[PDB]
Write an enzyme that holds these catalytic residues in place. Sequence first.
Site, short mmCIF file in Angstrom:
data_model
loop_
_atom_site.label_atom_id
_atom_site.label_comp_id
_atom_site.label_asym_id
_atom_site.label_seq_id
_atom_site.Cartn_x
_atom_site.Cartn_y
_atom_site.Cartn_z
N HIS A 210 0.53 -1.00 -0.08
CA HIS A 210 0.29 0.24 0.22
C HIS A 210 0.78 1.55 -0.13
O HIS A 210 1.80 0.92 0.30
CB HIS A 210 -1.03 -0.03 1.26
CG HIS A 210 -2.25 1.02 1.61
ND1 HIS A 210 -1.46 2.63 1.68
CD2 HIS A 210 -3.63 0.82 0.34
CE1 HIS A 210 -3.06 2.87 1.58
NE2 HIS A 210 -4.06 1.63 1.38
N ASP B 92 0.53 -6.77 6.70
CA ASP B 92 -0.30 -5.78 6.21
C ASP B 92 -1.52 -6.27 5.81
O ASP B 92 -1.73 -6.80 5.35
CB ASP B 92 0.16 -4.44 5.23
CG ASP B 92 -0.81 -3.81 5.25
OD1 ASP B 92 -1.95 -3.09 5.53
OD2 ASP B 92 -0.20 -2.73 4.30
N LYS C 192 -12.23 -1.85 7.89
CA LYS C 192 -12.57 -2.69 6.36
C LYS C 192 -13.57 -4.07 6.78
O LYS C 192 -14.43 -4.22 5.87
CB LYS C 192 -11.12 -3.26 5.97
CG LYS C 192 -11.03 -1.56 4.87
CD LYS C 192 -9.57 -2.07 4.17
CE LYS C 192 -8.93 -1.15 3.79
NZ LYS C 192 -7.19 -0.30 3.85
#
Lengths: 728, 728
Positions: A221, A314, A353
């Site tokens: 990201h 991540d 999320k």
Amino acid sequence: SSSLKIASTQEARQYFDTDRVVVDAVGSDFTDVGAVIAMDYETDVIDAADATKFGIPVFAVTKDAQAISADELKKIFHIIDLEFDATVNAREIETAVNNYEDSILPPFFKSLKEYVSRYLIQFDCPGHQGGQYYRKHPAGREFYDFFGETVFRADLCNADVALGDLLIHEGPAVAAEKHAARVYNADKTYFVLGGSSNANNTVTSALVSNGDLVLFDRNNHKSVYNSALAMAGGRPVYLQTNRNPYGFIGGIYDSDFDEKKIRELAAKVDPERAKWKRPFRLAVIQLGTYDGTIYNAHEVVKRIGHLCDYIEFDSAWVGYEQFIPMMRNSSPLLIDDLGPEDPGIIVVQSVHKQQAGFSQTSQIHKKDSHIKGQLRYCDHKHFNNSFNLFMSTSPFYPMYAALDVNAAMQEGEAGRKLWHDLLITTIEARKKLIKAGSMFRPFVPPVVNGKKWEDGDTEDMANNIDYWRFEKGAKWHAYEGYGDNQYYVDPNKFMLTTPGINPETGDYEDFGVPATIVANYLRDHGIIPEKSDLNSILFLMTPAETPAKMNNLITQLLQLQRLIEEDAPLKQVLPSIYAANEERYNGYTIRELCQELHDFYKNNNTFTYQKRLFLREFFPEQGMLPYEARQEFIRNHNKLVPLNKIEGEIALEGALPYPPGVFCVAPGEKWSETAVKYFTILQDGINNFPGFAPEIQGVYFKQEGDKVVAYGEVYDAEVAKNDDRYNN
Amino acid sequence: SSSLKIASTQEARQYFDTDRVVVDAVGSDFTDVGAVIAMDYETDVIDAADATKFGIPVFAVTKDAQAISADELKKIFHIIDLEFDATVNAREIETAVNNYEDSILPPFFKSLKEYVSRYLIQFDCPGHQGGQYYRKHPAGREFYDFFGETVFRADLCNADVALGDLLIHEGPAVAAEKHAARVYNADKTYFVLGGSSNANNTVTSALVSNGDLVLFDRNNHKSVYNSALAMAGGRPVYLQTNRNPYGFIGGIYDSDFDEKKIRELAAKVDPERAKWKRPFRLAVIQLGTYDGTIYNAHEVVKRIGHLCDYIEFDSAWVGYEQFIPMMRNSSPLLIDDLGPEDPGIIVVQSVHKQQAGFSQTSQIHKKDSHIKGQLRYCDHKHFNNSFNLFMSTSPFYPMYAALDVNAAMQEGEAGRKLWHDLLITTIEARKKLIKAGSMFRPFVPPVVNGKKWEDGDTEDMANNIDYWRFEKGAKWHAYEGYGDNQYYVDPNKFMLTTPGINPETGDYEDFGVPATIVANYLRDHGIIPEKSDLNSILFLMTPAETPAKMNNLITQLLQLQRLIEEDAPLKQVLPSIYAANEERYNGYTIRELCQELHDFYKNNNTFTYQKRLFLREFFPEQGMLPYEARQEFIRNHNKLVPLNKIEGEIALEGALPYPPGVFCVAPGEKWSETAVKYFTILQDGINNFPGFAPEIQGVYFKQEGDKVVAYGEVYDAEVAKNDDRYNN
Ligand SMILES: Nc1nc2c(ncn2[C@@H]2O[C@H](COP(=O)(O)OP(=O)(O)OP(=O)(O)O)[C@@H](O)[C@H]2O)c(=O)[nH]1
Ligand SMILES: Nc1nc2c(ncn2[C@@H]2O[C@H](COP(=O)(O)OP(=O)(O)OP(=O)(O)O)[C@@H](O)[C@H]2O)c(=O)[nH]1
């Protein structure tokens, strides 16, 4: 004070007394129930409360306790015998309700609920003081009434000392984080209120020193490119990633997880790799990709772990794998065999999320106690120092409570059941679409164990990893670099493919339905998808879905299917995009637009370039390090160059295209031919098709003539030498 | 019990076990097949079963399932792998056959089949009790043996309660109707066993009160004149219709679909039109005319809909337009945008005409849920009350089953394909006749999109509306009052024109072949047409036709063509009409008869009068309302007047001539000059040409001298005043 209700069956009503709170009947979800009170023979009501695994106390009124079934006694909590009927029964039931509420309410939220229950005259921060400033102005009064009294009343600060300290971790604040740390099998847990972006800034700024080597995943990201490299000064050793003809973000190449390639690749510094047992300080790998590619965290630690001091996963797109038995190998917090020769494990995850949390809530799970007495270890003092650089001095309490509540919601058999029941719903929904021969097929294996996917038992499929695995070399997924038992299909990402691509032959089909048509159709019919690429559409799955919500989706996809196979007018199918761009799409029908939008990407070989951008053979050349590039950007040593003249120029900013939503040219890297090709295709697509334009960051559009041209901030060596500030 | 066979290919035979039912080879239509079992490589057999879209389970035996093609897996239902060969495979295949038969068999027929399978001693109605009365007498035994045991065994009644209730709609009976209601996109479906005649009596007697205004289509069938006006007491506001030089029943005039003309016309009651937002209770429009004129139902609702509480579409001649994508605009059940300001939609359709059903079977599709909470709404209680006035208390079960089976036959991709394949056959058959320069040309546009009709791609033409449209003002159809995108050529009505008319100039040609010669010729050669007017012949098209049947038609029309262009004797061409009327047609040849029969209609300007009867300028004068006229008829206030003295007299009965087969003088209306002219021509034609006489109802023939004179029941005001019963 308390809001929990008592659910009792008809016959049991006149046997107790707590008509203090609302008593109700059983046909409930049991989510607002404090204590269930049934009869020994009312086995189906006792079985229903037990089935939810919430842990609600079940009281069974009986005539003969010595005669009750043994299997039912495991479900019953206390027995109200009839061999006294008094006020003592009213005590036990009230105490059960209280001991239960003390159990389900986590540490920080419990205190926030109590504090708000008081009438306290606030003269501290925030200045609105219980939202009383808002209700003094008409605009604010509309804001107060829209959200309610509570969100303003719960907005407190450090001066309300009873709630602890959210920065140096004290009181109920640290109690919440110590609870989450037990729930996620980690040493320490840090609650970040600035999303995984700032949590990514925390991790890397705490471990990476200017010049340290970082084993970089090319799929990472933007926040990991910015913090680890551009801000901290780390130097990347990029690992190439997989991409199929759909442009799906796949995992790292199997051949890249080789020590001999890694040390060879690490020739950024010849001695830092030549003999150093551990050449990397940090290794950032993206555990779960957007397109549903989740790694085998156990195999990653085994293969690159002894070369890194720390490894960061991540896990912002996942997290639920710890609670789903089938996916245990994907959870880096469940690794048992850790000793001193292993790396320290950091796990960053965005709770909002696909977990339960407000937007901007995230957390870091630190699991490094196995390397406690060595120079490489990063203790709580070091880590919290970084935490405080990014954490605000005035955090929002309701957001902190959301993370606290999420940890409780994932805890035990009650949270795991919710993810389990969701799998049942998702497996059954995919089967509906497959069996109904839809043109929007779900990305799963076509044949598992000699039988078709849809022909497997839903219960088995919810706990059998074979149904969700990317088999090495299998044609369906078409990823050319996967090994055995290395990647799995993330079951919670309802990923549907759209016609136009043939993974079999590796090329485009004659006719295609671009995913953006599906996206805009559903959006007009109320259904908001997550994203749509060129030939695929995604829906995110959390326990918030019910079979009803899925059926309402499958229905609207079957309606669009018939409107395409019969060729309906564009004003009928997509009226929002038409009543904005009429003279451009005049007289068009969906198939007319479908063939047009498909051929553009087909004739441009868009998936070939989408693949190359993440292949080492086509990585841009590093003309400057990311840190050096940002410094030149700060110093204004730049020029805005258009794409037609940009090849070879040193990019000062990361070029971010959607798809894949990952950097294609990191700052410091010079624009490759592949980068210019792919960006030109999407640039032309913005011009050619207004309404179906892909999102694009890192580049700046300038209206030049009838078309909108793309520009980019690039290094200007002329401004660098003609600047007496940093030496002529 | 079960009759479904298993179709397996040679190599696949020794891999399964259900030698319980007749197994066969593949080269079949798949209509009697339960499950198809082929090999993974036998792609063409797997593709053939799939192509029929019936939904038959396809079992593919394979050596390597992981290697099967992805496009073929969509066609395969289950995989029988070889990596056990057992009795479990025999279960799956049997269960597939069972789940398939449960799917294709509709709700009521399925139960009737099961009930008959029992040995039940019937002592109820019908008295023949399983046809056992019939086999006790020689005449009945001949009747029993002609039809078979089953039609008598299936003839049951209410006392056989397992089958439901066909009047107050219960059990499998309502299940059948609720299924049809889903198939036709309607709220509720009523199965009528008395044809669309009694279904027309149901609709109007449920909605029309004595005195209510009905927006009447002048083309409406006799049942709509009788029920809506004569029986119920509704008062018509007639809309003029189109007629071309062939006497074809065209649609309503474009200029008549104007609110200002309609309200002006509605001066039957000055206040019921003056301010009433909705002056009409019911509006009956004939969606599909006999001659192939199908409306744009979407445009009809948009233009007259806000003036009517309800609109009835007498769709007895159509129905298939819902299942043919090209004709969607013609289907009133597919209208999406309905709200409370729109009218209620009733759709009456005779299933037997051009759908699958026995004679006398019809159904009503009610689509009015969008106007549910208003006074004008007609709920199920109100509608079923009317249904029961016309429905018998002892309905015939086999006929109910036919309607049930029809709904299944129109359902999904299997039914739509049948209508699609028929279009291919019909388009190809018309091309054969056009390219072979026949004198019997099909009524279609001569030039579509700059190319000739026959020069278009058959597949495109089957799904392109341009090939089947009546273009505004185009000479070929010669209808003077059509607007843009308002009418379409019904593709399923094989309408052929015969020489004698020139639509170009609007008049007769020198030589002509009257359609009745073609009709009698084909009838002698076994081919039974539907009807023949003066210069046109019709054949009805349903999926019952095969290219072979069409070729057998085109052949016999080419034989008659040469017998006419070479002038053959009448005893050779038409031997049936000759060996009955010898001394009248002695020595005649076809051209001698053709010129004679053509000149009679030519010199009488028969098409000019055929046109005027449906024009407002020539509508008869209303001397009494239809209800009042029928009451006078009941009371015997009438006299039989011959046609030569009838002009001006009030007709008590509707004068029905063939052509057009629609009322020309409705009861209550006084005989117009145009009515007397047209009837006199046909009267003389009966006399002049025995054997080629047109069918005629509403008038009574009396043999007076050498000729047969025509009479009609007309009002006698003398008998009215000389009757002391209803006041002197
Ligand atoms: N954020 C966070 N803080 C914690 C947690 N557990 C304890 N703390 C805080 O950390 C403090 C203890 O840290 P240190 O004084 O460095 O002791 P330590 O935990 O041995 O530090 P390490 O050397 O990293 O093991 C406690 O006083 C708490 O305030 C946790 O789960 N999360
Ligand atoms: N003929 C027919 N009867 C039906 C159908 N569906 C339901 N019914 C019958 O209609 C009955 C319900 O009608 P009502 O009691 O008036 O309820 P309703 O359907 O709300 O009536 P509406 O006010 O017209 O909506 C059921 O009990 C059935 O017996 C259908 O498709 N056709």
